[PDB]
Amino acid sequence: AISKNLPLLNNHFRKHWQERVRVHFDQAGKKASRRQSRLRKAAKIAPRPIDALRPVVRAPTVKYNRKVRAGRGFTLAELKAVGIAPKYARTIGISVDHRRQNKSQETFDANVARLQEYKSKLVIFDKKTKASEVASFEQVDVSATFPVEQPAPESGLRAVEVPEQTAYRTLRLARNEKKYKGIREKRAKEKAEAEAEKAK
Amino acid sequence: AKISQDVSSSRSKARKAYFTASSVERRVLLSAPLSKELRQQYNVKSLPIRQNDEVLVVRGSKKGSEGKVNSVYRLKFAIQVDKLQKEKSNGASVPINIHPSKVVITKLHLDKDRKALIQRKGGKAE
Amino acid sequence: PTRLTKTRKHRGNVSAGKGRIGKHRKHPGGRGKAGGQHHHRTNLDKYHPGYFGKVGMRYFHKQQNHFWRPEINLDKLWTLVDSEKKDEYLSKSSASAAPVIDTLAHGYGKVLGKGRLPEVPVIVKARFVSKLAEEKIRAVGGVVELVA
Amino acid sequence: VAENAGHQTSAESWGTGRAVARIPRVGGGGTHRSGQAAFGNMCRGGRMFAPTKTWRRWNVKVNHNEKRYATASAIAASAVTSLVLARGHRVEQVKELPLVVSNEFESVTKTKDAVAVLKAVGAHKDVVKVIKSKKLRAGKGKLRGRRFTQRRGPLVVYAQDNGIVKALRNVPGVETASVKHLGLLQLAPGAHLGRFIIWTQGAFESLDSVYGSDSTKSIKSGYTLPSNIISNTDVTRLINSAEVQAVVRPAGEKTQKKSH
RNA sequence: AGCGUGCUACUUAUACUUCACCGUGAUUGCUGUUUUGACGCUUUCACGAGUAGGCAGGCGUGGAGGUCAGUGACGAAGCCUUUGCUGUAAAGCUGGGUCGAACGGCCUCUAGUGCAGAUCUUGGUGGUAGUAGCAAAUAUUCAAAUGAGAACUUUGAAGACUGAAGUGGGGAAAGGUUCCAUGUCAACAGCAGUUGGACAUGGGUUAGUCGAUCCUAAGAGAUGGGGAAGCUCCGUUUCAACGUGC
RNA sequence: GGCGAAAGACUAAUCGAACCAUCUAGUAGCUGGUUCCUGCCGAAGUUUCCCUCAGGAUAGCAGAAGCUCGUAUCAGUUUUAU
RNA sequence: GCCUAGACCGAGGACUGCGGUUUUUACCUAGGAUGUUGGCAUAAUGAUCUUAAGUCGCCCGUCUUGAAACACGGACCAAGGAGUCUAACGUCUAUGCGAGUGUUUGGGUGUAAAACCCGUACGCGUAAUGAAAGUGAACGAAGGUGGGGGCCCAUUAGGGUGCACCAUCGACCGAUCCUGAUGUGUUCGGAUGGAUUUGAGUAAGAGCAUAGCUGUUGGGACCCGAAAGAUGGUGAACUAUGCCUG
RNA sequence: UGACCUCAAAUCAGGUAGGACUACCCGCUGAACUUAAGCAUAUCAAUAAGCGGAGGAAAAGAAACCAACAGGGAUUGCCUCAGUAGCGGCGAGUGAAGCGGCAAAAGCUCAAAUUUGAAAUCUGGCGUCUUUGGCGUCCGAGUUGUAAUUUGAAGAAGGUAUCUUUGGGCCCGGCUCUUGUCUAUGUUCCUUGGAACAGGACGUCACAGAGGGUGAGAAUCCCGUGCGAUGAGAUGACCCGGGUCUGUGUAAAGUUCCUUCGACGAGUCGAGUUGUUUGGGAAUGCAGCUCUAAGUGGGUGGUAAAUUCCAUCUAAAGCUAAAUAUUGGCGAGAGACCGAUAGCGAACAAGUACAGUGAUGGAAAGAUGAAAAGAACUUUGAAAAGAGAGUGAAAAAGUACGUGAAAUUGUUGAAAGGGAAGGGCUUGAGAUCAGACUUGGUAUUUUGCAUGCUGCGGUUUACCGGGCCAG
């Protein structure tokens, strides 16, 4: 049951796995029918675009801080800045997220500029709008028209400024300070009451 | 080549659709071409065979035989001509069953419904 | 292909290559890793030392995103410089104008100090550097800028 | 096969002591099935050994760059007359390869006109070869929708479709392909190199953009035409050269003389 | 023609020597004559047992891509055969006969791919073998008729037996047309068969009073209720506002 | 579970725990079988551990693929010396 | 040295060689059989099949130290009938690209399950080590010594350079142990220098992907084979026992 | 004599439930074989069987979330995370989630507020109309609370500057579905054949050379195919493009700022313990029992506890398409699938015949021919049959039907044979087969061809040379 110099395997096939085998023979058929659904939906609502405009947000965690991606909806503050009521905004292809807030200014400004770029190109029809004017429009892809773009990483040339303390020393000192913050605070405090009670 | 997704290239489906066709669907199957003379008299190239049409046999042992159709034996997928009979050693005669694809109609049995069918198919009847 | 297998060559020979005495059976020795401490001990000891037992402390709910910190050495640091401006940068660079290399935007966590640099000032931006890596960078007249 | 095929029985082995093999048997009585063996791959009505499953591997992955390597190699082979003749095409009455036709062929709309164009450019003998080579397939494949077999004719490669594809649709054996989408299943049928390809001038011009050159970059992202590991593909001409023959030793006999 | 011993000749192993051919391994040479095969040709030498097992090269079967503008109703495939040929072999090809609709070669792909065995599976057929046997229940015989045909059908005469706790005459359970007439003998009646509970075609079961139907028995079991996740369980007038009252 | 004047009796030719279907192709270190040809090479029943002793793992013996080299230094042998 | 009797074989296929006689740029017995004669071609010859004779030959498969066995299976024939597929892997081989590699989750496209095109991520790789906090690979031409194919210079030799790889001694990174500089939130820091210690490390990357044979593990797992166990149901027409009515 | 409350009755008026199907779905309940080379925890498996409940999908779902970041933002699925953190006689085994890329994207509703200058609300009866309903009226429900207003993203009541936006019904189209009808070109010639759909010649059409049929391989004989064209019937508050009539918009909704407020779900949260379950480890969820809250309170922050902060949501009420699943049903299209001992058990009057008391078990069985043309008639026979004849391309196709193997058997022929037979090797005999007078060359004569003597069989002895067997 255990022979030769081989890796030890974890093959989890001790249950009735043969009754739950899902083979995706319909991958091509699903692709084609997905395209047909997409075409029907696009043709139903033309020239109004198929996608709602989405914001741009920072990916969470220390691993994905660098990347920026498409969010769910513009916050109520971002819509407040461009003067669109959220109830109204949902009707003109702008997605809304009541849950997100803006602690920083960079994301808020980027999404405000995104909303302004969208609002500039928006043409809202009405009863007086006739079939010829509507016919003169093309159904765009909102996501491609307003793509989420990564901010440019720093490159080029800059002047060199060398601090006295090395970066390695800076990191070591920061680690040490964080490690001993609590014990140093406790020591300093108890010394404070010791020298403020016996010196009374 | 067939393009429609509603058309089947299956041999077994094609043969099942033929042998279990109803008598109404068998009427269209037993179509016969018209003679060269009628194909310009009516400007129609083929019609479902009928009881009182006159046909000329063009293929088989009975090629060249003429006569008026007697019955469209739809169950047997065949027609029986007036004098296309085979005699048994008994002395009785049995009709010879010819397929309508192996005859030409030399004279149509024309009434109100046939003429409308001829007009429908782009031809001239009257 | 089944035609190139030895099953096609074993046809006609009684045992199909499994021997007449041994008599290929269902599971002699057990199933899986059975008997690893009893009758398969001689195999586990020889080829998989350290297999049995506990070492170290548990870590409930370990999130691997915290420990994300890909390394880049100094011998590979100039690949992060744009390819078409590398030669121009390598020639005219000076303390008044040196190329800036943001290692974080390229997906790296720590700058390590293996290899030798071109004798060219650079401005390196990293979340972390090793002691030797930063000594080598300042030795060519560069600097390390810590970012977050 | 069906998952339960051969296993719709309640059979039990009779055990030993009843002078019959220990295979499971159908119980009950009154039918002739009673007492008959069951469930075995050796038994009539049992299930086959290792019944076939749908999660067998059906598709195979090929590296994209390798697939493009093969496409380029087949396109190159289409211009070698010995390979086209070995492939089996009647190209002896075509003066030179590749065969490039003016773009007026991209706009034909009737099969009669397209057939006349094929006749004019000398590629109709191969169409007639296709017509004549129609035979009934041998074996049970003719019960499964593969009733007739024939040869492969020329492949027509175009740049703009103005009806050439529908015009050549009904010509037997002739395949059409856009220059943008060329695949190995048309370029080397049966893994045998040397398809007979008729290019339009538009497709022939677009080839250099599709696969690039030393001056043109391929539209395919990051793609370059592959490099041969040998620079001169004629080795006899290389061997019988001044460079090589000025340093070799004199040759012995073609056949050693029997000295004993 | 025994025993001890010596000598001479002679006999013969797939052993040894020389030679031929096969294969394997090594080895010589081969492009200004390499020439349409260098995965080839060529020189020389040695070697050849073999289970379990390993590897290599091949033969064959179903299906797939390509090709032979392949074979075929003037006969495909299959099958039989001292018609032979080829290959060490797996096998391939062919002559003759039979037969009637498809099938092969070559380059590749693919697999439910090769049987003498498994008290193998299913089907079929033998020897045994015209053999064992067709022997309980006392017992049959003569004639006539019918019929192609009579030990066995019908009728007569006789002889018998069951011997009223019957081989009699009825029923309950169970069967289901076996009932009756006419016709009939392919199969069945372990011989036979003109006979039959067989086969085919028809016909036939009549109720106020005979039964069921009604009553209650051992019991079964709704309802109101009470359990139980629930399928359902308990209870039978039950902790009930219980008459489809007269 | 029943039933038993008790035999482990009987419970539909089934009883020291019925029958039917399913889980289920239950597991088997044990028995039986395991399908074409030729060519080349070719064993082991021994070591250690195992609730191990009809079984495994391990080393050994065998094949295959080769790779670095081209007589280097090697040998189931003798001699001399020790 | 000479004479002499018999048997078996005749591979090869222009010439080339070694010799000999030289009367000779000739010939020979000297790197493998030719000459001549007869007969036959309705046949001499060869092959196969059937059979006789002589001689040898036990019935195959199987487990086994040992089978013709008085060990087991096999009356006979046809057809079916047993190492398969998958997930994850190891070695090796082929192919593509190569510090990268992988299009095919998805989108675009289409002659529509194909073919063709696209790209973000992600996987594996490019860095290790420690339980962890953490730290994180050049003294030197990426080191020295002994070999080392090949190449260069020679002219046997010899000298130079020496990739892969082998032996060896070191250097670098992490862990462990020791030492403890300038300093300090006075308990932190950890420079420097070491240690019969340790790592699946560095020391000018080798991988990734696809395919194939083989081997492994889990799966019904080469095929057939239990005595058992569980879940849900069906039976008191037999039989056991009680009761009711005869 | 009357209301009210609670509880009844009625063949009261009008409704509703049950049962069936099984592939997927939501729950409950719940094993053991098996693996661990034994076995008890574990594993199989939070599976099979059992029970309850649905739909075209179901479920879930607009945070008492994930996190610890520069933060994301309902639910679901895929790829990945990851065979990882972890769990585990720390053995065998097992094992998620966050992030990221993508598919699809859609949001909301109540309770808790005095309408209080007017229960403004709703079922039913009756009447009527233009009827999935409207209008009127009368009872009834309801104040122990039916409407309007608000749902934490807020919002309310006042004040505020003005601005912005807008209801319904019918009629025809469109889009979706179903369905009707209509369409190119040889049956020209010759040969074989029973039959031409075969071979050959000459063709024709082709947005149709898919497939099927017809007496053999049929683009062109027929149906279809391809291309489309044109009718009809549906269907859609919850699709839009138009007309047309009503719009009761002193209405409603939103938008700015100010002030004051801002109700927010209890035997619930939470805690202990027990059991089960989970990767969840001083306890992941669920459930029982005991205890049992609060109002910046409460939950979460994966090691128990106290002290102090921070971050993040706002439970104990509710609805909601799509992306996802689908061995059932309905309808289609396909395949490197099987080809009648195979493939479903079933290609057939197959869940049939038949067995069993019952639950249940459960087969075998395709093919004459193009067409029955299925053998008239004569004769022998009691008949079945036979012999003639006849039909047929074929009776070497007669329903005991295409081909018709082997075992096994009959007849004929050959051969051998003292208690087996069979085999190898060798030769003999008999039978069969093969081969050089070669594609032999040399002059030769006549026989024979369309032809104006020319390729070349024919013959016999000469000559040369050969083959084979021998000396």
CSV table of N, CA, C and O (backbone and C1' of nucleotides) in Angstrom, one decimal, chain H residues 20-41:
chain,number,residue,atom,x,y,z
H,20,A,P,-50.2,9.5,-4.0
H,20,A,O5',-50.1,9.8,-5.5
H,20,A,C5',-50.7,8.9,-6.5
H,20,A,C4',-50.5,9.4,-7.9
H,20,A,C3',-49.0,9.6,-8.3
H,20,A,O3',-48.4,8.4,-8.6
H,20,A,C1',-50.3,11.4,-9.0
H,21,C,P,-46.8,8.1,-8.1
H,21,C,O5',-46.0,9.0,-9.2
H,21,C,C5',-46.3,8.8,-10.6
H,21,C,C4',-45.5,9.9,-11.4
H,21,C,C3',-44.1,10.0,-11.0
H,21,C,O3',-43.3,9.0,-11.7
H,21,C,C1',-45.0,12.2,-11.1
H,22,U,P,-42.2,8.1,-10.8
H,22,U,O5',-40.9,8.9,-11.0
H,22,U,C5',-40.7,9.9,-12.0
H,22,U,C4',-39.6,10.8,-11.6
H,22,U,C3',-38.5,10.2,-10.8
H,22,U,O3',-37.2,10.7,-11.3
H,22,U,C1',-39.4,12.1,-9.7
H,23,A,P,-35.9,9.8,-11.1
H,23,A,O5',-34.8,10.8,-10.6
H,23,A,C5',-33.6,10.9,-11.1
H,23,A,C4',-33.3,12.2,-11.7
H,23,A,C3',-33.2,13.4,-10.8
H,23,A,O3',-32.0,13.4,-10.0
H,23,A,C1',-34.4,14.0,-12.7
H,24,C,P,-32.0,13.9,-8.5
H,24,C,O5',-31.9,15.4,-8.6
H,24,C,C5',-31.0,16.1,-9.4
H,24,C,C4',-31.4,17.5,-9.7
H,24,C,C3',-31.8,18.4,-8.5
H,24,C,O3',-30.7,18.9,-7.8
H,24,C,C1',-33.4,18.6,-10.3
H,25,C,P,-30.6,18.8,-6.2
H,25,C,O5',-31.7,19.9,-5.8
H,25,C,C5',-31.7,21.2,-6.1
H,25,C,C4',-32.8,22.0,-5.6
H,25,C,C3',-33.0,22.0,-4.1
H,25,C,O3',-32.2,22.9,-3.4
H,25,C,C1',-35.1,21.6,-5.2
H,26,C,P,-31.6,22.5,-1.9
H,26,C,O5',-32.9,22.8,-1.0
H,26,C,C5',-33.5,24.1,-0.9
H,26,C,C4',-34.6,24.1,0.1
H,26,C,C3',-34.3,23.3,1.4
H,26,C,O3',-33.5,24.1,2.3
H,26,C,C1',-36.4,22.7,0.6
H,27,G,P,-32.5,23.4,3.3
H,27,G,O5',-33.4,22.3,3.9
H,27,G,C5',-33.3,21.9,5.3
H,27,G,C4',-34.7,21.5,5.9
H,27,G,C3',-34.7,20.3,6.7
H,27,G,O3',-34.2,20.6,8.0
H,27,G,C1',-36.5,20.2,5.2
H,28,C,P,-33.0,19.7,8.6
H,28,C,O5',-33.7,18.6,9.5
H,28,C,C5',-34.7,18.9,10.4
H,28,C,C4',-35.8,17.8,10.4
H,28,C,C3',-35.3,16.5,10.8
H,28,C,O3',-35.2,16.3,12.2
H,28,C,C1',-36.7,16.2,8.9
H,29,U,P,-34.0,15.6,12.9
H,29,U,O5',-34.2,14.1,12.6
H,29,U,C5',-35.3,13.4,13.1
H,29,U,C4',-35.5,12.1,12.4
H,29,U,C3',-34.2,11.2,12.4
H,29,U,O3',-34.2,10.4,13.6
H,29,U,C1',-35.1,11.3,10.2
H,30,G,P,-32.7,10.0,14.2
H,30,G,O5',-32.1,9.1,13.1
H,30,G,C5',-32.6,7.8,12.8
H,30,G,C4',-31.9,7.2,11.6
H,30,G,C3',-30.4,7.2,11.6
H,30,G,O3',-29.9,6.1,12.4
H,30,G,C1',-31.1,8.0,9.6
H,31,A,P,-28.4,6.3,13.0
H,31,A,O5',-27.4,6.3,11.8
H,31,A,C5',-26.5,5.3,11.5
H,31,A,C4',-27.1,4.1,11.0
H,31,A,C3',-26.1,3.0,10.6
H,31,A,O3',-25.7,2.2,11.7
H,31,A,C1',-27.8,3.2,9.0
H,32,A,P,-24.1,2.2,12.1
H,32,A,O5',-23.6,0.9,11.4
H,32,A,C5',-24.2,-0.3,11.6
H,32,A,C4',-24.2,-1.1,10.3
H,32,A,C3',-22.9,-1.2,9.5
H,32,A,O3',-22.1,-2.2,10.1
H,32,A,C1',-24.6,-0.6,8.0
H,33,C,P,-20.5,-2.2,9.8
H,33,C,O5',-20.4,-2.8,8.3
H,33,C,C5',-20.9,-4.1,8.0
H,33,C,C4',-21.0,-4.3,6.5
H,33,C,C3',-19.7,-4.2,5.7
H,33,C,O3',-18.9,-5.3,5.8
H,33,C,C1',-21.4,-3.0,4.6
H,34,U,P,-17.4,-5.2,6.3
H,34,U,O5',-16.8,-4.0,5.4
H,34,U,C5',-16.7,-4.1,4.0
H,34,U,C4',-16.3,-2.8,3.3
H,34,U,C3',-15.0,-2.3,3.8
H,34,U,O3',-13.9,-2.9,3.2
H,34,U,C1',-16.5,-0.5,3.8
H,35,U,P,-12.6,-3.2,4.1
H,35,U,O5',-11.9,-1.8,4.3
H,35,U,C5',-11.5,-1.0,3.2
H,35,U,C4',-10.8,0.2,3.7
H,35,U,C3',-9.9,0.1,4.9
H,35,U,O3',-8.6,-0.4,4.6
H,35,U,C1',-11.4,1.8,5.4
H,36,A,P,-7.9,-1.5,5.5
H,36,A,O5',-7.5,-0.7,6.8
H,36,A,C5',-6.7,0.4,6.7
H,36,A,C4',-6.9,1.3,7.9
H,36,A,C3',-6.3,0.8,9.2
H,36,A,O3',-4.9,0.9,9.3
H,36,A,C1',-8.4,1.8,9.5
H,37,A,P,-4.0,0.2,10.4
H,37,A,O5',-4.2,-1.3,10.1
H,37,A,C5',-3.6,-2.0,8.9
H,37,A,C4',-4.6,-2.7,8.1
H,37,A,C3',-5.4,-3.8,8.9
H,37,A,O3',-6.8,-3.7,8.7
H,37,A,C1',-4.5,-4.6,6.9
H,38,G,P,-7.8,-3.5,9.9
H,38,G,O5',-7.5,-4.7,10.9
H,38,G,C5',-8.1,-6.0,10.6
H,38,G,C4',-8.5,-6.7,11.9
H,38,G,C3',-9.5,-6.0,12.7
H,38,G,O3',-10.9,-6.4,12.3
H,38,G,C1',-7.7,-6.5,14.1
H,39,C,P,-12.0,-5.3,12.0
H,39,C,O5',-12.3,-4.6,13.3
H,39,C,C5',-12.9,-5.3,14.4
H,39,C,C4',-12.8,-4.5,15.7
H,39,C,C3',-13.4,-3.1,15.6
H,39,C,O3',-14.8,-3.1,15.8
H,39,C,C1',-11.3,-2.9,16.5
H,40,A,P,-15.8,-2.0,15.2
H,40,A,O5',-16.0,-0.9,16.3
H,40,A,C5',-16.3,-1.3,17.6
H,40,A,C4',-16.3,-0.2,18.6
H,40,A,C3',-15.7,1.2,18.1
H,40,A,O3',-16.4,2.2,18.7
H,40,A,C1',-14.5,0.4,20.0
H,41,U,P,-17.3,3.3,17.8
H,41,U,O5',-16.5,4.6,17.9
H,41,U,C5',-16.7,5.5,19.0
H,41,U,C4',-15.8,6.6,19.1
H,41,U,C3',-15.7,7.5,17.8
H,41,U,O3',-16.8,8.4,17.7
H,41,U,C1',-13.5,7.1,18.6
